[model samples]
Target chain A: NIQIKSIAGITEPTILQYFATLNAGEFAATAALFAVDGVMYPPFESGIVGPDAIAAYLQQEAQGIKAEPQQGLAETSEDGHTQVQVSGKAQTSWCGVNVLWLFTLNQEKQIIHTQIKLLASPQE
Target chain B: LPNIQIKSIAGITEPTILQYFATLNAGEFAATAALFAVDGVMYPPFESGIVGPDAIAAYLQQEAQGIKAEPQQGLAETSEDGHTQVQVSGKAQTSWCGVNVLWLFTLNQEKQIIHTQIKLLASPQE
Candidate 1:
């Protein structure tokens, strides 16, 4: 019942659908997976609130980039909120970089928040 | 506009790392130091490494007074050697003054920071 290969450790239905939908270029569908008041934190940008906001932001930004999630880890806190971290490669027209995605989901299995980060060289 | 405040970027989702910032912001230098491993190292700008929890506590208590870090964005990764590496970019603020900075942390399996470095960044005006 677990989704295999892509994002090996993720099995949650909505999380799995997120990668599938996003990679399929269905930005709206991807946004739909979030709760109505869901927030997304894109790297170097302010948080985008609500599903409409996510859709509007991603419609332009998600273009030409494919998310290839390699691994994911999930955890639950004392408040019962669920968080998932995914690491993978984001392929773009001009370059490719390792990216990390952190998702926070509600009890209903709806994504409430998401954050993105890109791994870079550490030494100056 | 009365004021234009830049909301911080978000990315680092680790609880311990977040706690470190919260503790530091609270001016609990010893608590912040306690979050590190017994032999953890702290690298501040233009200074030699401060090693061990006790030493880090001493360094931060002296230098971190009136300083607050507002993390803008961060990335977390598992290094090739299996340590958890986290890098955060943010603003370090003092009374009437502030500068952007990069903070790098290396945590062991127990999630205690083993090495942490603070690097200053050039301001946009520069």
Candidate 2:
């Protein structure tokens, strides 16, 4: 579990901690880190706006699947925004697939958006 | 000229896009298009999203078969949501000399490009 120091200050490590929180199944804590009107993208679903929406979104995605965060994939923009690319083996009761998450954070140190894409499946 | 912005998902930057063009002009069609994901899609002028890497390579090879393009004065900006949009204006030694282009790229978590759409500005002018 990664522990972060602040939410107002957006840094690389702090962002990773946010991922760790999500991976650890702390959905609420993870959503709380975002700005009040943040957003999340879950696979084919539409964008979820606001903290409550994000919390609910994560809850559904976290079900029966563990999200592991990989390293060496974090990047920050010159405009004070950060995008962290995380990949992991998502195991579900039906099947297991390798997935990737792309998180976008704003200059205010708030998570503005998240986009999740599938890397590959065993059958593929 | 329309102001161009380049915003990319994590791990992708302006240099990456430029490198793509560089490789394309270098006659490395396979390596150039390989920058895209296995199921990647691209949309060229007057065409819908051309799905997959093979199709993209074929399209590029045909278009560049008898043309020499020298891209210059490029600009990039990343959107708040991490999408990258780019504008590149340069001279193509084809039927037209001056050309302008707009490109939008969607990147996957592994930093591999998942989708791209290209828009050519006013046709090359003498």
Candidate 3:
């Protein structure tokens, strides 16, 4: 069955599960959904390669942030690569803004890369 | 039928657009009045963003000569209203310049490209 929405192809349930996994602090779950050699580019910064690298990076990073995930827009390429854009209202004691997350999936339907571009202000 | 009416961005005309997309096959930029309208815009993503057709065409041809841009197929999307997102992938093989690129083109209602953005997904190290 077609697992995604019309344009994005990413199911709504998947979106909720992703955030929930993160909220529950399940690093392995996040890594499992990503490809072995997945990449994540967080805007102006250099992209991290591979799920292993990402898991390690998150350990040192992910310092402090409490937020919710709100689905935004989604677009899919004919080749089965889905681009899901997400945003949310973030509540933090320090800083925050509206964020745009671009998730790129590979042929296997596994997310191989992601591009996070800042679309709005950080919630503070 | 498409509600989005894109005013001429390049200072040139339609014949030029045909040639421009054709030149894209070799990944080389071509000098054509077609890529722009009287007020058309050209966002090459990495280089300078151009406004007028004359300047846009000139830059395109000039750059094409030095850096070869192979417009390989990456992603293709078609819409009834002429709205498409074409993902072009290619390799740059200049000295100290090895990069894999995936760029997107958002065509206007008339099928003319209005917005362009490129991302260097990977780079071959020296």
Candidate 4:
């Protein structure tokens, strides 16, 4: 049972699936994973609140940017809150970069907050 | 028989964290990176990961070039497990106008940062 459940009954696969949603550019789907009044902090933008605001912000932010999820690390706090740091390649208007996505999930299994960090360029 | 008197620098404190920022604003790249562990890792919001003191120092030196940071309102706190999270809002004059950033630090037993993650919060709107 311990092997099956990583933290708070949430598995790694479940969290990656959430990352996939963002990479897939499914703003609605991604927003749906959050609480009704969830919050999101997108790089170079104001903090977005609620599902509607988050979706709209994501729509603009994700526009023309193709992100592919790659390797990452995830862990759960003693309070049962989960934190994941997922990084991947992203193609934006200016150029290509490595993007790190941070997610914080509440005990309810819903994403309470998220933050996106972009590392300017790629290095082999 | 080792009798080296070693003193543990208590977990990262608010004042020390602010001092870290002060060093950053002062363009003291070496000093800034020195606050981290010898094998510390820094993940900048606009660059790749820089590990070790030398690499971190070089990276910060390069980043501090032609850039000045004026920090504004900020908050710092450490988790029970000693993970320090600092939410910093500041104005940077580089390539553009004002910008906001968040600095999250994970420290080791010696109160030196082992890992740092920088987040770009926002920028001047057009």
Q: What TM-score, to 2 decimals, does candidate 2 have?
A: 0.50
lDDT of 1 by residue, A74-101 (tens): 6565667776767667887877776667
Position B17, candidate 2: lDDT: 76
Worst 10 residues of 1 chain B by lDDT: B1-10
The model with the greatest lDDT is 1
The order by descending lDDT is 1, 4, 2, 3
lDDT of 1 at B47: 85
lDDT scores of the candidates, listed in order: 0.75, 0.59, 0.52, 0.63
Please state what fraction of the native interface contacts candidate 1 reproduces: 0.00
Estimate the TM-score of every prediction: 0.50, 0.50, 0.50, 0.47
Model 4 gets an lDDT of 0.63
A1-124, model 4: which lDDT tens digit per residue?
A: 0122122213466465565666567777777888887788877886888888888878886766666554444456678876665555677768687666777777777878777776534322
Ranking by DockQ: 3, 4, 1, 2
User: Compared with the true structure, what per-residue lDDT tens digits does model 3 show for residues B73-111?
Assistant: 333355577765444455554555666554555455666
- Write down the C-alpha DockQ for each prediction: 0.02, 0.02, 0.14, 0.06
Docking class of 3: incorrect
RMSD of each: 11.9, 11.7, 9.5, 11.0
Ten residues in sequence with the least summed lDDT for candidate 2 chain A: A2-11
Q: Candidate 1's residue-wise lDDT over B1-126, tens digit each?
A: 212222334666787688788778877788788889888888787688888889998998888899978886676777567778776767899998788666778798888998887765432120
lDDT of 1 at B98: 87
* TM-score per candidate for chain A alone: 0.88, 0.74, 0.74, 0.76
